[PDB]
Amino acid sequence: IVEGSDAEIGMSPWQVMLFRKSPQELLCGASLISDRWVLTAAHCLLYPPWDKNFTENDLLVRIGKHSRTRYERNIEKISMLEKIYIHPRYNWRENLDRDIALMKLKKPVAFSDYIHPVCLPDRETAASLLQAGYKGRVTGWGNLKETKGQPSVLQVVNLPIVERPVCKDSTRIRITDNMFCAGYKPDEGKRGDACEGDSGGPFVMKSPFNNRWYQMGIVSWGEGCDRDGKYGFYTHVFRLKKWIQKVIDQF
């Protein structure tokens, strides 16, 4: 994240870190949606342009973390993957359309003060909250800037959803209804964006109707990080929920 701030302890308890077993490194962000299901961006697992195509045993998921690099004894829980599920129409060839994937855990993870699931939006919550001007929150251990390098602990930044025509006009990539963009405009003064390594992490919003946090988006792509006139793009979770539900109901 660029131009964010350190997260408070237990601020984002659904935050999950996608971790490569060898070499041991951070791959992407993710989110806990139940005691055995983790949501992330499809491209964190499968991306042929960069010869990325991870199998279950190549990965680990670390839940309830704050520090990026330290092993958080008695706090974080590390889990192995049972099975990976990628959207059947995930478009890795062109514009990362339907950039979503689910990861089923070998064993349920125990909830604690630092580990707890976020809610997925129903049609009405999405309609009421996903509106230009309304701010969401993005968290991740991704790069701090485009050229310090990487954070010590989880970063957070609040960003306004942007009008769809503005999103469209800011890029050459073909935008779809399965995406939305967020961030401040050059004239608004405030800054901030997601960056490399933040992908797969959640863009959440706190419902003023029932005071619960909902995951509206998944960090997907951008053009640079925190550049003037450019906006970060996120997977539209509600629009792909029928697939999410189908995988969880079937599997």
């Binding site: 077993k21 680990l60 330290r70 092993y71 192995m80």
Partner: peptide, 10 residues
């Protein structure tokens, strides 16, 4: 840069 995880998870 990552501190070792319990090889046990590996």
């Amino acid at each position: 840069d990552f501190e070792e995880i319990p090889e046990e998870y590996l």
